[PDB]
Amino acid sequence: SVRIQVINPNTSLAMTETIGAAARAVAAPGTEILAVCPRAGVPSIEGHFDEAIAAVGVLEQIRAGREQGVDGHVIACFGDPGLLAARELAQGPVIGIAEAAMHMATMVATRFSIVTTLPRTLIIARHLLHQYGFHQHCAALHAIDLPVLALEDGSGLAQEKVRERCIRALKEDGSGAIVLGCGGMATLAQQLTRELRVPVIDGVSAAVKMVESLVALGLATSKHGDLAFPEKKALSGQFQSLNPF
Amino acid sequence: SVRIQVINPNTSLAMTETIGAAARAVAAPGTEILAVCPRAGVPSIEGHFDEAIAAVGVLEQIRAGREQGVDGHVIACFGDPGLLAARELAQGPVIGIAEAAMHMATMVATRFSIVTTLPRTLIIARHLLHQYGFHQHCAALHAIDLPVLALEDGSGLAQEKVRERCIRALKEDGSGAIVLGCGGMATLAQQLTRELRVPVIDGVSAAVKMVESLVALGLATSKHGDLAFPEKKALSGQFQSLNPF
Amino acid sequence: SVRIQVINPNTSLAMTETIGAAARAVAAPGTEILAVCPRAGVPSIEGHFDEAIAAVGVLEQIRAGREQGVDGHVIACFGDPGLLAARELAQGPVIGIAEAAMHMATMVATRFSIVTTLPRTLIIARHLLHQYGFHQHCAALHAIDLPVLALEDGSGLAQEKVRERCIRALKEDGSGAIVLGCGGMATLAQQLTRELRVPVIDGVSAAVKMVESLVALGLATSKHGDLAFPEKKALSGQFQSLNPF
Amino acid sequence: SVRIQVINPNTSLAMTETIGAAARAVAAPGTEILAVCPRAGVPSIEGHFDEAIAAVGVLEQIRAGREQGVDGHVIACFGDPGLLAARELAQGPVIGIAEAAMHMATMVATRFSIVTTLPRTLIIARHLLHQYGFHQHCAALHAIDLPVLALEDGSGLAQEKVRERCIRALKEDGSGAIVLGCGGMATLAQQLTRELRVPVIDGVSAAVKMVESLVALGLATSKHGDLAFPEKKALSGQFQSLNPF
Amino acid sequence: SVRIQVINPNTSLAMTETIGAAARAVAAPGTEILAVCPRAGVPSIEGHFDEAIAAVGVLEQIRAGREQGVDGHVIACFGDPGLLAARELAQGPVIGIAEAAMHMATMVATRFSIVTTLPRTLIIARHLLHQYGFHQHCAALHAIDLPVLALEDGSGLAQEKVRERCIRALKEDGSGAIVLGCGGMATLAQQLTRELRVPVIDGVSAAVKMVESLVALGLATSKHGDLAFPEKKALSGQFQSLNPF
Amino acid sequence: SVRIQVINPNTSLAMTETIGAAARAVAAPGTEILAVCPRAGVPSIEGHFDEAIAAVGVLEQIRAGREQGVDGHVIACFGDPGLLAARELAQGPVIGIAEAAMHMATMVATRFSIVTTLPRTLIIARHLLHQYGFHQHCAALHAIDLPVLALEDGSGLAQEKVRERCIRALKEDGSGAIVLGCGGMATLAQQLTRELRVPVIDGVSAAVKMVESLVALGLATSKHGDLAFPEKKALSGQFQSLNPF
Ligand SMILES: [Cl-]
Ligand SMILES: [Cl-]
Ligand SMILES: [Cl-]
Ligand SMILES: [Cl-]
Ligand SMILES: [Cl-]
Ligand SMILES: [Cl-]
């Protein structure tokens, strides 16, 4: 009855499976998850260059989603790459996983801490905090200092480091909740929540619920003004498939 | 399966019915709405004095909700009176209708406008914008210059004035969506949305979906630090019933 | 000639005496202090639940003050509970002790540090900083990690911990002054000021001087718009005594 | 018993008399006002160039005040020129009239409007709002479009224009109080307050009360860190008299 | 001696010529301008979708520039698309035209106004203001309500509308300068400046001077942390050419 | 062909030589540097008192510069004393060294750290950050805890301490660049940049390039409104020479 396109903006099939599984586990009855990734792009997103590439992959999948008539979309990278570009292109609502996780966090705690991957992604998270208006609600940001794909490498090392940093954060930061700063951490939310007895929030699941909520409310992206469909233009080269509408 | 206590912070039975009906119309299967109001308080909330009284009524109902074992609560006045006090007292999550409406608005538009009741409530809305961090996302705030209860007076006058102000806002403000600034406007959201072809958002329905989403995510108010249960204290007089736990 | 109602928002007679004594010690000639507390409420204020209860007690006393024809009021809890609600109800000006202490601090130092009671009250102080617009002027906030009433328990332990934290703050924070974050610390201001040779500010005394200043200036709360007397409404139950005017 | 040096930063004897009279009218018993102006400077302050000159004149008088052993100082130009430089040099507290008027305004209204002289002084007022942290509390700023000295020219034209702009502001701005943006408007505060039935605030009188309050509280400028006495240095030329201490 | 790659992020050869000419007219002796545009993309940039496409075109040209050993780059669209992604990829500095125009504006005026193309680009300009930290320095933003390419259509209509809006802005906004909000307006800066006798700033020329200044200062993009070269990754499909280094 | 007056706001001939040499080393062909200092003032600037004195010395030299017909001016103290007053008085543009260094820093790094002289100057730097809008772009501020003139004392001690603090900053702060917080550090920029392999920015050289850029762009200070020439006034005493125009 409700179809939600969950877009992994990176090309890693491994991470697409982690993300898709987290999406399906919290999905309401009647919700179908379509877990996808771009055909062309970058295997993981860890910086501004990666984000700009991922944004175009997101747009490719948004187009696919829209021609399939999906009810909504999630952007399952913590940089929310191409969020506003996607909202212009899409009919249904588009929710980012950083956006969704941060929003939820303000509903269950006064302040939250972020636990992310590499140090260079911290500035990306900071920018989103300021953009979404949640900077005052974030007590601290931490990186585990391992690449994104370390979460899929089978060792459990990155998972253990997330745990240790969550404990440290709750002891030191003066925050009441954790926001996980990576789509690949989606699996850890429920276990850390039960273990640490505080909300540990995965944006993937959170974004699924937001799309479902918006659909049930009969609310979709405003096509009045800023997020109107793109002006009709001739797109050249590899971009020509992006807006057939 | 899921029980959500929807608290009208004012004592108006009329408004409690409007609010309860809006809550039930968007509720997911298996969700039961418990539409309540305080036994003692003010018939409508239009200023700081009214809010302080309403906050204590909210707390009385939160206590009732918690002893009944409800899954979550909504505070159905646009001042979100007693929100943080309620989160301390409650086990399940507590969502305000201004909070919920504003959050949803940022998901479907770049900026929104608020349409509220009396001029003196504008400063209350402004304070919430700054508190929740959405000030940059709000293009403008407008009052229809009629008391809250005018919405229940049967004339359709307040309803018509909301409509006219929504049209005016969308023409002038540079915003893509409307946030309704009163629990009693809940009925108008879906009709104005279809009529004006932009999201017109009722916080009551929005807050119901947030409680449902949080419950499905296994997330509840953090009891670590700021929103921990109140320190155990002897409450005197009319307050002695508030915290039997 | 000038009568100032100093309202301890908690029910502790012990703290009411500390507060009343601090108020009388700095009062100008011709100023009479009326040190009061609510008949029903909470013995100490340490969180959002406590604040919401205290706000209604403040309002009960504001009503008493106004029917007695007092010239002004102070709210002698560092959360300034019910400040705006009180200004609506009162004719004379109403000054909070956090408000007053923070205002004074910006007049004698570039930045100040706050020394308060429990960790969970820090977020309350932070919110007031942002509301009053003094966030940039506050270098740091510290808690002594003892309940409010520890200040009245006779051991001198809380008093010693305030001293130690003040010294630490002045060494580490890059601030030129201390704001005491509790009505019960009122006694310590003058001694710590002389001892540490920097302004250590008690909001109780500071608020008394503000009421006196405003009265001498012929300035009272604006009854135009936001802080106008509450809309005339029927108050039910235990609230019915709040607005007989 | 208490001696307060009220410094008109401009060289106009006419304005010094207006300022001195406003200071004496609200002064507490036992307070002596010393109304002064620099020996060298500018006849009125209307821009950044004027302010920089006025700041040095303020410092010359601060030195005189300090060698006379005054209890405190006011800077009676609405640009508060040389405020922090003065606090370094002075032992007693130094209060600006913009600072004092704005502080008082937040105690009696949610938001205020400013009515000042020339358009080019608006940016000066805006900068002070941001510096003191009151930007959110200021609804609007207006200029009467007449030079500062028009207030002393005997025609009553500038006085009438202040009145008309105050009425306009209260009708249009959504504010509950007026801050007068010129030392020469000091005379109008009490009459406009009675006439318009809202607080109309003169910073001159307000600053006098702040100095009196701080003195009664045993609080003076912090000499720890930022506002410590200037580093001992050889001052050349016309500056050599500024710091004989 | 100094080679500066000026990148038109849109595919319009017409606009590339306007941009290249504006760049060459202010270039210092010894500076060579390389005016380029992407091989694949969108003919004009008017919204978020357009920006995301343009960012990847910018990156394609950055790569070309870097393999040619250019000294620096400018991004000649007023959305500064792909600015941070480009700084990661490039060795020499990368300056956006909105960034450069806004920076210059704060050096010659207290506040500026923006005159841009379509209403839907205003929110893009607003976001950049907040990101670069210039929001307080911008008095107002205006659109001429014509598409970007109207500037190249030969009628002089868009040019006349820019002029009229500049005059209107200087009369109404309380600003001392204009920032042109489109690369295609580059031609108008010098003529409007002479005609209106205020700074009217073209970001294209401004960005050229910044690259020249940074090169002469021996300053280039920091490769420490946030703007380090992208992590070495396998790029698939049409993206595989982006990072051969 | 281009004449730039570089004003050392302090009276130290030693520092004037350091500043003049740094200015000449990056100057474009055809640019003549006029390195000057006031005839009367303070030997070094380390606090608010010093700044107010230095501002008037700056104005004295601005007048000299303008009667000589210079193309622009730099204010070579890191407090940018008298910047706006100077822009009013001058015809050519006036650039501060803090202003210029901070502006450049945002072009080559996401965030920067400041390394300055005495602890009491940190608050001055903080105020400029907020004024120029760069507060979010500054990761941290550090003082070497030595007076300004220690840089000219020949021991190399202050120089070594700058180096050590730069290394520490880059390890700890999460910043990609250093802004030198003193005119006397100008010499160190190029050596530390090469040594630490990140941009280490001297505002003196940076400000020279900005004046050159603005002149080449045909842009000068706006004489419309806020930065118009001062209102024609009779200046008395030692100030009478400041505005003969
Ligand atoms: Cl991610
Ligand atoms: Cl409501
Ligand atoms: Cl308290
Ligand atoms: Cl004035
Ligand atoms: Cl453009
Ligand atoms: Cl310096």
Short mmCIF file of N, CA and C in Angstrom, two decimals, chain C residues 61-170:
data_model
loop_
_atom_site.label_atom_id
_atom_site.label_comp_id
_atom_site.label_asym_id
_atom_site.label_seq_id
_atom_site.Cartn_x
_atom_site.Cartn_y
_atom_site.Cartn_z
N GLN C 61 1.03 34.27 44.75
CA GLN C 61 1.62 35.36 45.52
C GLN C 61 1.57 36.71 44.79
N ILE C 62 1.76 36.70 43.47
CA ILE C 62 1.60 37.91 42.65
C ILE C 62 0.21 38.51 42.88
N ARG C 63 -0.82 37.67 42.82
CA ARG C 63 -2.20 38.09 43.10
C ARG C 63 -2.31 38.74 44.48
N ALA C 64 -1.77 38.08 45.50
CA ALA C 64 -1.73 38.63 46.86
C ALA C 64 -1.03 39.99 46.89
N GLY C 65 0.15 40.05 46.26
CA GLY C 65 0.91 41.29 46.16
C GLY C 65 0.13 42.42 45.52
N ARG C 66 -0.53 42.12 44.40
CA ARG C 66 -1.30 43.11 43.66
C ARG C 66 -2.52 43.61 44.45
N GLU C 67 -3.20 42.72 45.17
CA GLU C 67 -4.35 43.17 45.97
C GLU C 67 -3.91 43.98 47.20
N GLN C 68 -2.66 43.79 47.62
CA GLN C 68 -2.04 44.59 48.67
C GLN C 68 -1.48 45.92 48.15
N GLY C 69 -1.39 46.06 46.83
CA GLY C 69 -0.87 47.28 46.21
C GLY C 69 0.63 47.47 46.32
N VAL C 70 1.40 46.38 46.23
CA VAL C 70 2.86 46.47 46.27
C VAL C 70 3.39 47.18 45.01
N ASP C 71 4.59 47.73 45.12
CA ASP C 71 5.19 48.49 44.01
C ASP C 71 5.89 47.60 42.98
N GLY C 72 6.29 46.40 43.40
CA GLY C 72 6.97 45.46 42.51
C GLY C 72 7.22 44.12 43.16
N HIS C 73 7.71 43.18 42.35
CA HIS C 73 7.88 41.81 42.77
C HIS C 73 9.22 41.26 42.29
N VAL C 74 9.83 40.40 43.10
CA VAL C 74 10.92 39.57 42.61
C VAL C 74 10.61 38.07 42.70
N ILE C 75 11.05 37.35 41.67
CA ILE C 75 10.92 35.90 41.65
C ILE C 75 12.28 35.31 42.03
N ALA C 76 12.35 34.82 43.27
CA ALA C 76 13.62 34.43 43.88
C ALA C 76 14.00 32.95 43.72
N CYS C 77 13.75 32.41 42.53
CA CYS C 77 14.34 31.13 42.11
C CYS C 77 15.11 31.37 40.82
N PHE C 78 16.28 30.74 40.70
CA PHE C 78 17.18 30.98 39.56
C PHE C 78 16.66 30.46 38.21
N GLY C 79 15.52 29.77 38.21
CA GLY C 79 14.86 29.41 36.97
C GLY C 79 13.90 30.49 36.49
N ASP C 80 13.78 31.57 37.27
CA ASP C 80 12.78 32.62 37.04
C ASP C 80 11.40 32.05 36.64
N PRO C 81 10.90 31.05 37.40
CA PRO C 81 9.65 30.39 36.98
C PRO C 81 8.46 31.36 36.95
N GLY C 82 7.70 31.31 35.86
CA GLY C 82 6.49 32.11 35.72
C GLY C 82 6.71 33.60 35.53
N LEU C 83 7.91 33.98 35.09
CA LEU C 83 8.25 35.40 34.94
C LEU C 83 7.27 36.17 34.05
N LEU C 84 7.03 35.68 32.83
CA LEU C 84 6.16 36.41 31.91
C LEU C 84 4.68 36.35 32.30
N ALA C 85 4.26 35.20 32.83
CA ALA C 85 2.91 35.04 33.38
C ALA C 85 2.64 36.03 34.52
N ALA C 86 3.66 36.23 35.35
CA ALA C 86 3.61 37.16 36.48
C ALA C 86 3.51 38.62 36.02
N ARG C 87 4.27 38.96 34.97
CA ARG C 87 4.25 40.32 34.42
C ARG C 87 2.88 40.67 33.84
N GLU C 88 2.22 39.68 33.24
CA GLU C 88 0.84 39.86 32.78
C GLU C 88 -0.11 40.16 33.94
N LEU C 89 0.05 39.42 35.04
CA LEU C 89 -0.86 39.52 36.18
C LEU C 89 -0.58 40.76 37.02
N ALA C 90 0.70 41.12 37.15
CA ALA C 90 1.10 42.22 38.02
C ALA C 90 0.95 43.59 37.36
N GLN C 91 0.81 44.62 38.20
CA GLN C 91 0.82 45.99 37.74
C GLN C 91 2.25 46.54 37.84
N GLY C 92 2.87 46.35 39.00
CA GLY C 92 4.26 46.74 39.21
C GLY C 92 5.19 45.82 38.43
N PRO C 93 6.47 46.20 38.31
CA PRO C 93 7.39 45.34 37.57
C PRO C 93 7.73 44.06 38.33
N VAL C 94 8.04 43.00 37.57
CA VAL C 94 8.45 41.72 38.13
C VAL C 94 9.82 41.35 37.58
N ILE C 95 10.78 41.15 38.48
CA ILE C 95 12.17 40.86 38.09
C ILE C 95 12.59 39.50 38.62
N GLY C 96 13.16 38.67 37.74
CA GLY C 96 13.70 37.37 38.14
C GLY C 96 15.11 37.51 38.68
N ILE C 97 15.52 36.58 39.54
CA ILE C 97 16.88 36.66 40.09
C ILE C 97 17.98 36.21 39.13
N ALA C 98 17.67 35.31 38.20
CA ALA C 98 18.64 34.96 37.16
C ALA C 98 18.79 36.15 36.21
N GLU C 99 17.65 36.65 35.75
CA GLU C 99 17.58 37.85 34.93
C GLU C 99 18.41 39.00 35.52
N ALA C 100 18.14 39.34 36.78
CA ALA C 100 18.84 40.45 37.45
C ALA C 100 20.34 40.21 37.62
N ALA C 101 20.72 38.99 38.02
CA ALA C 101 22.13 38.67 38.24
C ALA C 101 22.93 38.73 36.94
N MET C 102 22.35 38.18 35.87
CA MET C 102 22.96 38.17 34.55
C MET C 102 23.12 39.58 33.98
N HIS C 103 22.06 40.39 34.09
CA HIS C 103 22.09 41.80 33.68
C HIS C 103 23.22 42.57 34.36
N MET C 104 23.32 42.44 35.69
CA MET C 104 24.36 43.11 36.47
C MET C 104 25.75 42.66 36.04
N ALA C 105 25.87 41.37 35.75
CA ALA C 105 27.15 40.77 35.39
C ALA C 105 27.74 41.40 34.13
N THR C 106 26.89 41.68 33.15
CA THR C 106 27.34 42.30 31.90
C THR C 106 27.76 43.77 32.10
N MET C 107 27.40 44.34 33.24
CA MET C 107 27.76 45.73 33.54
C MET C 107 29.11 45.87 34.24
N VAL C 108 29.65 44.77 34.75
CA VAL C 108 30.89 44.81 35.54
C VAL C 108 31.99 43.87 35.03
N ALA C 109 31.69 43.10 33.99
CA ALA C 109 32.64 42.16 33.41
C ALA C 109 32.29 41.93 31.94
N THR C 110 33.25 41.47 31.15
CA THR C 110 32.95 41.15 29.75
C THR C 110 32.20 39.83 29.69
N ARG C 111 32.65 38.86 30.49
CA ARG C 111 32.01 37.56 30.56
C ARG C 111 31.94 37.07 31.99
N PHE C 112 30.93 36.25 32.27
CA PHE C 112 30.74 35.69 33.59
C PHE C 112 30.67 34.17 33.56
N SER C 113 30.87 33.56 34.72
CA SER C 113 30.60 32.14 34.89
C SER C 113 29.45 31.93 35.86
N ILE C 114 28.68 30.87 35.64
CA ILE C 114 27.60 30.50 36.56
C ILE C 114 28.02 29.32 37.44
N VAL C 115 27.73 29.45 38.73
CA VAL C 115 27.92 28.35 39.68
C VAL C 115 26.56 28.00 40.28
N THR C 116 26.04 26.83 39.92
CA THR C 116 24.70 26.42 40.32
C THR C 116 24.71 25.13 41.16
N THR C 117 23.54 24.51 41.34
CA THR C 117 23.39 23.40 42.28
C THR C 117 23.62 22.02 41.63
N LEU C 118 22.57 21.48 41.02
CA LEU C 118 22.63 20.14 40.43
C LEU C 118 22.90 20.24 38.93
N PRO C 119 23.55 19.21 38.35
CA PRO C 119 23.77 19.16 36.89
C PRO C 119 22.51 19.38 36.04
N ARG C 120 21.36 18.88 36.50
CA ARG C 120 20.12 18.95 35.71
C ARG C 120 19.52 20.36 35.61
N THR C 121 20.04 21.29 36.41
CA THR C 121 19.60 22.68 36.36
C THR C 121 20.43 23.49 35.36
N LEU C 122 21.55 22.93 34.90
CA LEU C 122 22.41 23.62 33.93
C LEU C 122 21.66 23.97 32.65
N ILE C 123 20.91 23.01 32.12
CA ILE C 123 20.09 23.22 30.91
C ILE C 123 19.04 24.31 31.11
N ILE C 124 18.53 24.45 32.34
CA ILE C 124 17.59 25.52 32.66
C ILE C 124 18.30 26.87 32.57
N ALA C 125 19.48 26.96 33.17
CA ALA C 125 20.30 28.17 33.08
C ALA C 125 20.67 28.49 31.62
N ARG C 126 21.02 27.47 30.84
CA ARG C 126 21.38 27.66 29.43
C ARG C 126 20.23 28.28 28.64
N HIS C 127 19.01 27.79 28.89
CA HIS C 127 17.80 28.28 28.21
C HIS C 127 17.53 29.74 28.54
N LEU C 128 17.74 30.10 29.80
CA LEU C 128 17.57 31.50 30.22
C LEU C 128 18.60 32.42 29.58
N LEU C 129 19.83 31.93 29.45
CA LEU C 129 20.90 32.67 28.78
C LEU C 129 20.48 33.03 27.36
N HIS C 130 20.02 32.04 26.61
CA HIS C 130 19.54 32.24 25.25
C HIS C 130 18.30 33.14 25.17
N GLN C 131 17.36 32.93 26.08
CA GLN C 131 16.17 33.78 26.15
C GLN C 131 16.48 35.25 26.45
N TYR C 132 17.31 35.50 27.46
CA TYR C 132 17.66 36.87 27.83
C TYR C 132 18.71 37.49 26.89
N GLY C 133 19.33 36.65 26.06
CA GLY C 133 20.31 37.10 25.07
C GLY C 133 21.74 37.24 25.59
N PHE C 134 22.06 36.53 26.67
CA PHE C 134 23.37 36.67 27.31
C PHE C 134 24.33 35.52 27.08
N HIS C 135 23.97 34.61 26.18
CA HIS C 135 24.76 33.40 25.92
C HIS C 135 26.22 33.67 25.59
N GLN C 136 26.47 34.72 24.81
CA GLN C 136 27.85 35.09 24.43
C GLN C 136 28.64 35.65 25.61
N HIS C 137 27.92 36.21 26.58
CA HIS C 137 28.52 36.81 27.78
C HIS C 137 28.81 35.78 28.88
N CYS C 138 28.35 34.54 28.70
CA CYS C 138 28.62 33.49 29.69
C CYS C 138 29.73 32.56 29.22
N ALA C 139 30.86 32.61 29.92
CA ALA C 139 32.02 31.80 29.57
C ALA C 139 31.81 30.32 29.88
N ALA C 140 31.17 30.03 31.01
CA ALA C 140 30.98 28.65 31.47
C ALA C 140 29.90 28.53 32.54
N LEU C 141 29.34 27.32 32.65
CA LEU C 141 28.38 26.99 33.70
C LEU C 141 28.88 25.77 34.46
N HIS C 142 28.79 25.84 35.79
CA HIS C 142 29.24 24.76 36.66
C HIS C 142 28.20 24.44 37.72
N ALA C 143 28.12 23.16 38.08
CA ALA C 143 27.28 22.72 39.18
C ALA C 143 28.16 22.19 40.30
N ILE C 144 27.75 22.41 41.54
CA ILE C 144 28.48 21.87 42.70
C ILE C 144 28.07 20.42 43.00
N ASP C 145 27.04 19.95 42.31
CA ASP C 145 26.51 18.57 42.43
C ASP C 145 25.96 18.26 43.83
N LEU C 146 25.24 19.23 44.39
CA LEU C 146 24.50 19.05 45.63
C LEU C 146 23.12 19.66 45.46
N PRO C 147 22.09 19.04 46.08
CA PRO C 147 20.74 19.57 45.99
C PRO C 147 20.65 20.98 46.56
N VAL C 148 19.66 21.74 46.10
CA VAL C 148 19.43 23.12 46.52
C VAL C 148 19.44 23.28 48.05
N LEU C 149 18.71 22.40 48.74
CA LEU C 149 18.55 22.50 50.19
C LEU C 149 19.81 22.19 51.00
N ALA C 150 20.82 21.61 50.35
CA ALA C 150 22.13 21.41 50.99
C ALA C 150 22.69 22.74 51.51
N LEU C 151 22.27 23.84 50.89
CA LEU C 151 22.70 25.18 51.30
C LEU C 151 22.11 25.61 52.65
N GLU C 152 21.03 24.95 53.04
CA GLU C 152 20.34 25.26 54.30
C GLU C 152 20.56 24.20 55.38
N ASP C 153 21.41 23.22 55.09
CA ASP C 153 21.53 22.04 55.96
C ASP C 153 22.52 22.21 57.11
N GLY C 154 23.16 23.37 57.17
CA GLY C 154 23.98 23.77 58.31
C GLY C 154 25.43 23.32 58.33
N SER C 155 25.80 22.41 57.43
CA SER C 155 27.15 21.84 57.40
C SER C 155 28.21 22.77 56.82
N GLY C 156 27.79 23.74 56.00
CA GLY C 156 28.73 24.61 55.29
C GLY C 156 29.41 23.93 54.11
N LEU C 157 29.00 22.70 53.81
CA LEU C 157 29.59 21.92 52.72
C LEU C 157 29.32 22.55 51.34
N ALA C 158 28.06 22.85 51.07
CA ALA C 158 27.67 23.46 49.80
C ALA C 158 28.33 24.83 49.61
N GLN C 159 28.41 25.59 50.70
CA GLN C 159 29.06 26.90 50.73
C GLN C 159 30.55 26.79 50.36
N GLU C 160 31.23 25.79 50.92
CA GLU C 160 32.63 25.55 50.61
C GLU C 160 32.83 25.14 49.15
N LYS C 161 31.93 24.30 48.65
CA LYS C 161 31.98 23.87 47.26
C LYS C 161 31.72 25.01 46.26
N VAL C 162 30.87 25.97 46.64
CA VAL C 162 30.65 27.17 45.81
C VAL C 162 31.97 27.95 45.72
N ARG C 163 32.60 28.17 46.87
CA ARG C 163 33.88 28.87 46.95
C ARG C 163 34.94 28.23 46.05
N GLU C 164 35.14 26.92 46.21
CA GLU C 164 36.13 26.16 45.42
C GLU C 164 35.86 26.23 43.92
N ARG C 165 34.59 26.18 43.54
CA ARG C 165 34.22 26.26 42.14
C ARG C 165 34.39 27.67 41.57
N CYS C 166 34.18 28.68 42.41
CA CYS C 166 34.39 30.07 42.00
C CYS C 166 35.87 30.32 41.70
N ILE C 167 36.74 29.88 42.60
CA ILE C 167 38.19 29.96 42.41
C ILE C 167 38.62 29.25 41.13
N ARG C 168 38.13 28.02 40.95
CA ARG C 168 38.43 27.23 39.77
C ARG C 168 37.99 27.93 38.48
N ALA C 169 36.77 28.48 38.51
CA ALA C 169 36.19 29.20 37.38
C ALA C 169 37.06 30.39 36.97
N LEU C 170 37.46 31.20 37.95
CA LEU C 170 38.26 32.39 37.70
C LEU C 170 39.66 32.06 37.18
#
